[PDB]
Design brief:
The structure is cut from a larger assembly and holds nine protein chains of nine kinds.
Chain D lengths: L18 E6 L10 E7 L12 E6 L24 E2 L1
Chain G lengths: L1 H29 L8 H9 L2
Chain H lengths: L17 H6 L2 H6 L4 H16 L11
The structure holds one RNA strand of 150 nucleotides.
Protein name (chain C): Methyltransferase
Organism (chain C): Trypanosoma brucei gambiense (strain MHOM/CI/86/DAL972)
Organism (chain H): Trypanosoma brucei equiperdum
Amino acid sequence: RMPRKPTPYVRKFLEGCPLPETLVDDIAGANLKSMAPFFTTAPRYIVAAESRLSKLFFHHALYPAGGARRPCRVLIVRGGRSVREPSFTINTGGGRGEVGGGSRGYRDPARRAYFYARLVKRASVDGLLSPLCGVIEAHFAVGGTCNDAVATEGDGTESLAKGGSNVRAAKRVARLLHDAAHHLSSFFYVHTQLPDSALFVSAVFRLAGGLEPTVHFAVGAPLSVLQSTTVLPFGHIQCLLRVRTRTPWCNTAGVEPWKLGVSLDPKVPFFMRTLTEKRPSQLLVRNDCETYLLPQRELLLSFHVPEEAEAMCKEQNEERMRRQAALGYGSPSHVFAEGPRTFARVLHGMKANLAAVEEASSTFRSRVYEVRALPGDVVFVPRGWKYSVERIVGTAIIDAVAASTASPREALRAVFRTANAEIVGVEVDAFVLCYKPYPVLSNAQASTYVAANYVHSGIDDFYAKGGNDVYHKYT
Amino acid sequence: LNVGVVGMGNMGVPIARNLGFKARSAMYLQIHSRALSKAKRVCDDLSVDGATCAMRIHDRYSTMTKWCDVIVLALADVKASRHALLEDNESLIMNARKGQIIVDHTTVDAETSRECAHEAARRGAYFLDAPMSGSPRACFNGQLLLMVGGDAETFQKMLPIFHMYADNVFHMGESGSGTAAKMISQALVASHNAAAAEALSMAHALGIEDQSKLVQVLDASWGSSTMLRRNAPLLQDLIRNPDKTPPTSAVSVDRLLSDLAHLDASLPKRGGEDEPFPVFDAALRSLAAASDAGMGDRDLASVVHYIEAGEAELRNR
Amino acid sequence: ITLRPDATVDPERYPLGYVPLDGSESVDSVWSLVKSGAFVAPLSKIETIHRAHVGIRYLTQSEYPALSSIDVVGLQTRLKELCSRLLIRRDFWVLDDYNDPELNSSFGIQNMYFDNFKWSQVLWRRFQQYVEEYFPVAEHTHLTYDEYLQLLRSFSHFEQGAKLLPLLPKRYRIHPPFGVPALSRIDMEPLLLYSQWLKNFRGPLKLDAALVIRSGCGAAVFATKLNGVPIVRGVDPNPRAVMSCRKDAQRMGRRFDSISFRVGEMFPDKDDGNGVPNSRKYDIIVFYPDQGCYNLFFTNAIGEYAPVLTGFAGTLEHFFEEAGDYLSDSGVIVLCCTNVYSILKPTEPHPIEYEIKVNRRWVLLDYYDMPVRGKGTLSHTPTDHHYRIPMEMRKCMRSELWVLHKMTSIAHFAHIHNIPGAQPPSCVVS
Amino acid sequence: ARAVIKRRSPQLWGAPGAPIIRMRGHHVVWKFQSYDLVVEHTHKRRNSDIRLLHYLGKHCPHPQKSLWSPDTPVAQDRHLFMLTTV
Amino acid sequence: WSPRDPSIFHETSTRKFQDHLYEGEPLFMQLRQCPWRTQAKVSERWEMDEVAI
Amino acid sequence: RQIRPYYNLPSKSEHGRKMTGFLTPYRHWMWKQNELWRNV
Amino acid sequence: ADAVRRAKIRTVQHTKNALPFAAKKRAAQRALQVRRRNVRLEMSGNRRR
Amino acid sequence: DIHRLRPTSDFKASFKDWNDLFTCDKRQLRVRGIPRMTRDAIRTAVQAFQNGNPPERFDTKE
Amino acid sequence: LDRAAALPTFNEYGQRVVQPGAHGKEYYRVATNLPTVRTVDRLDVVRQDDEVLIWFVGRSFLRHQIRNMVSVLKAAGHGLWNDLELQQALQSGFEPSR
RNA sequence: AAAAUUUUAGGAAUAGUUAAUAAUAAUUUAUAAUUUUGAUUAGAUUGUUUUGUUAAUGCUAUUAGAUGGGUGUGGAAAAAUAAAAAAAAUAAUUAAUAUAUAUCAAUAAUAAAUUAAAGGAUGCCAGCCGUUGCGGUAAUUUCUUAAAUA
């Protein structure tokens, strides 16, 4: 029994309103009970919490419990990028023993907050991998006799970095430079392998900064790249670099249509919207691997959805509709019209809400989703998804009343900002961890695939053999 | 990490030897020199005495900077340090990487450190200045005073490297506070030596014979100082026998004045026509009087004879 | 609120003007909807909208990290914008999760304050009636979920009162009406420091009459009279707040007598002989300014014939300008606040010291500072979203107390500037 | 042997196990804390009215000055005393 | 610990080395540690038997 | 409790304990030296 | 002025010693409570039916 | 450093040298500003080294 | 608020409590009984050069009504109230106690 | 296993029932068993020479616990939470630690614990009389150890 102070009145029995553990699990990406009835092509945001994400939960995030045939989605994980120390064997002491280093994912954030009491001070990159980026950028920054065009051609780009061999790389670079020729100052992005300058021998090949970017929840085996020839060390780690071609400062510049009445004072006086740089008047895709982008700055990625994934989702959703719908729902004005909530009506409302979410997230056009990526994040892009990239420069504050009259441009109060042809310089805006293509389940494999059978083990066998074996656990 | 030493003067070779010895092949070592034969000799000696990590020898700042992560300069003069850091075509800070670290141990002016840190920040690198105080034998044995000024996280990153050749390492603040700490320490040393000279001369004037006891009395009382504790045993004989020439010492009047020569440049203004520096200026007067008397390289204990001259300039100016 | 589906994104598919939540969409999906600007309201369950509210606020905070003052302000703007899109039907009682008279089971924060039996029996109806006093069914077709939550919490205050534990003992409770900002844990700390200061400094200073200005909740007035002052007047611009403060002063017993609350702007009435409320020159005038994000940030000059500063600087200037006309010659004005202005916006000059040195109208008799202890929301607007201050910002936040006298009583206070360890200004030494 | 183990006070070989001499404390600030040498089971019994097997003694962990200094002073009899009954 | 302190004079004060006899405690000595030998550049310990008694 | 020194046989398994619990023959020998000192 | 100085000193030491005393005062409380009450689990059990 | 809640490896800059680490007692260890668990872990590792047991234990974090 | 406070509730002892106010006679009681419901045809504010000019146009006004309206309008101009506060003030109605 | 000590302003019936039995696992036999000496049910309800009070064998107060459907495992269910009783290698053993400092994170002081001694109240009135909204009026009076008590 527990002590309780006596009282001559009635005792109140509070039942409480805690934060739902299910919601916390869903946002953390570690919910193994949720079944999404309809598969969609829309980015999924998850916030890593104290390294609770792992290969086990990420496998389900890739292949949801509803029964999927492919990772047909973009997966943004705020934070969650890990950094792995090198490993070495202690021979001293009682005997030989490995020391593996470790992953400082949650322990070391990407950017520390700079609050000061007494042009403000902010961090725009990840401090842990600032120095590893330093070497990659210095490899190109040299102004020597050998032009950096050939360096980027050979060393930097692989066989295929963007939309359609050794000659192929040179013609690709030629097209890019010719396109960039007409502008006094332009830039473009590419995927490039690590330079030899960033690999020091130890025979252990280490990185320049002593730290390798990694995601502890990566499933499958990393992409292997050949120099037959040997494997390129740290070939799965790649860099998406921006090449140019030829402490932020704040500054303050000098109706509500959704309401019925007229508001004595507006409910939301001000807006705020991210400021992105101008794109010169090309996208890039990887058709051979599954990509994990780890931004080193604040990027805006516009992802173009492949027609293959779009058709897959549409056809599978319609198959579910015809299998489960009875066609008794009739035809209400809008799906959420009062009436007997048949299973068919519930399911139709579910699909309608899903379509509304997809069209709202996508911009006005095929389909393109705008994604704000930050340092510390990790964005998983499956195979075949296209995307263009820009850099975000800050934020604005827009008078709602003024923007109702003339425009957001004129309606500005305060803006916070952060700051053929030839290649003048190179930056690295992201590290791409490329992994060997994940399996695409055949129709029978998808039919017999059950999320429960992968709640403890079988993840690595699934990802190695390729999809789940039919007859996995029965006969 | 890859740590490379460039200074290689007289006080820089011990830093390279200590880094090579205590590296234990845990960090790579680099050595740069103006002439390759000298650095070859240094590497040969270090390997003969025991080398745990392979050592590379550099003639050019371009290779030096584009290879190593940490650069350590231990040079002789401000002009040499400026040559190494900024004004050279292959200047270290000009061609510095976005993340590499550069540390300077030579005693340069606060403004010199200002330009160095500003340019390093422009290029994205981190520069923190750590002037050193001690003897070359103190460096051999691994005892030194480093007063580093720069970024706190970079300083924390640099702790382990410093301890390989330094005992007392402190963080004086941001934006090159190490040079100010060294400068103020020298000024205070000079002032205390002057005051000790005054006290012993006054004791002799009063006619107290046993100085052995008076030394302990002063050391146990207030106003005690290591400068007194050092110069007393010599000053006692030097005042009772003013004829004998003060002996030569490694630490000299010329060295103190050279190291004080940065104070005027580091102070804001001298046009006020007044001295907001009574004691410090009085000590400087006597030090300069001793230097101009042909006693520049002799011991710091020679201020006794020229303190009286330390009044002529005060009266006339 | 009443919606107008014409200005909605997809009126043909959602003629009601919003997208009902069947209780299945993931909170990231609902968040994407709200970001695109659609309105979302629960279908048949309050739990769905509560989950969406919590998840959307967490996700937006994840998107816009509080790495500095500028992104904190931007986060607050964006988070207000989104949180003003999470509706609940004005007739919340129709939701099936609102009440269950047979299992005495419900959902929502009402059971963090009321017991399940009392709520499911009698208090659901009383809350239904309490809501209409502020949000008529005739006028409002829908309601914001933040408005619903604040209505529940203000109903808790109306029923069983609140409690200012560190300022006032366990036995004194207040009933601040809906819409009058209550006092959070962080907001008390400046008042705790002020209370200690007054406890120590009522003796040496002949401090008899106190005037608290903008004493919204009344906590400052109650703390002043508790630490001891025979006469306490409070001036608040809210008639409902003064009504409730006077009722609570009656309620708290005889220990709070001669506390008088009047409705007015920053300062009381100026009458000086027609009714002569004045001639009551006060020994101490207490100001505890509100510090919200917009008030602290958007501050500058406005007006051409009556130029005036806006925001925190404007309020401080008005206080400094209008004080003294109500102050005794040997009286001292106290301003208890936090350094949140100098945290949110360090680029511009510190207002209090700017006034004290540039303006040469007041003299710093004392300044006290104490690090912020607890955590919680700061200067919270009643019907706005909650935003608890993150750890890194809290580490810099401090509670300040500035005690100032007039330059005319410089001779009177001269001997107090002369104690060792004081900091006399340039004017006193002359 | 519990489905969910007492995570903070695990033991060996189950309850009530062998008798043990422990130095039991009191739920008091250290400023007055004193111990008692008691014999009890390995798994502390907080169910029966009999908490312990035998009370061996008490220990005062706060030194006390020698009140007995004048009585036949022996070598170093003025050092502080630590009192114990056994 | 003088009894003239009203907090030491109280019956329930622990600033004593006894109980029921008196209050406080007159001037007494205690020896602290000075673990700073190693801060010195050369620290040595010389083992020699007592000679002064 | 049982000490798991960094240099005994590691179990290269990702479905359980990462270090086995076996030990090098030197650890067997030194453990006796501790056992004997305890036996006296 | 002496009374003012005494009050100033009292308030200054209060501001300085507020932090350490709360840690000491808090610790004395956690050393005197036999079993702390899990109000979270009590409320969850009350909700359960 | 073996335990996820005893990050001894985060306080390499909290001590000046080997002897400074080995001579500082629990009180000075707390004064330098170290959590309770990290403080106890450092103290126990130092005492084990003193007794002859070097810090040779398997990192259980993974 | 009085109506809610009158509606049924439970005592501190668990007893049932119902004040008379939450009853049909005292429940459906309109606010006012006196003729304080007046019309103001025009009520506008115009900014002259250095002056605000408030025009009232009505067939009849209550005592000090113009000056109290001006007071609350000045409060609004300084930015001290909101729509909720205006509605609460308007619903408060006549206050017979000076 | 047993003996023995309970409460209610309107005081009555109780039962998977008592004993016997070659009956584990009762197809049997009997005039069975509880209760006005206060039962059963319902209401209150852990017990509790430790509390408080008094001249008082009076009055009064209380928190040690326990727990037939959640695994039949285990010597024993006491098993969904754990100020820690050190748990199979001396982890550590002159330290005030029994830390919060296991420091961030949706969340609210509703709630859970604990007694230091390092100026308010408060109106009234026909103006020859329409909803003009003037005045009298800066309206005047009541408000500035006890209750419960052994």
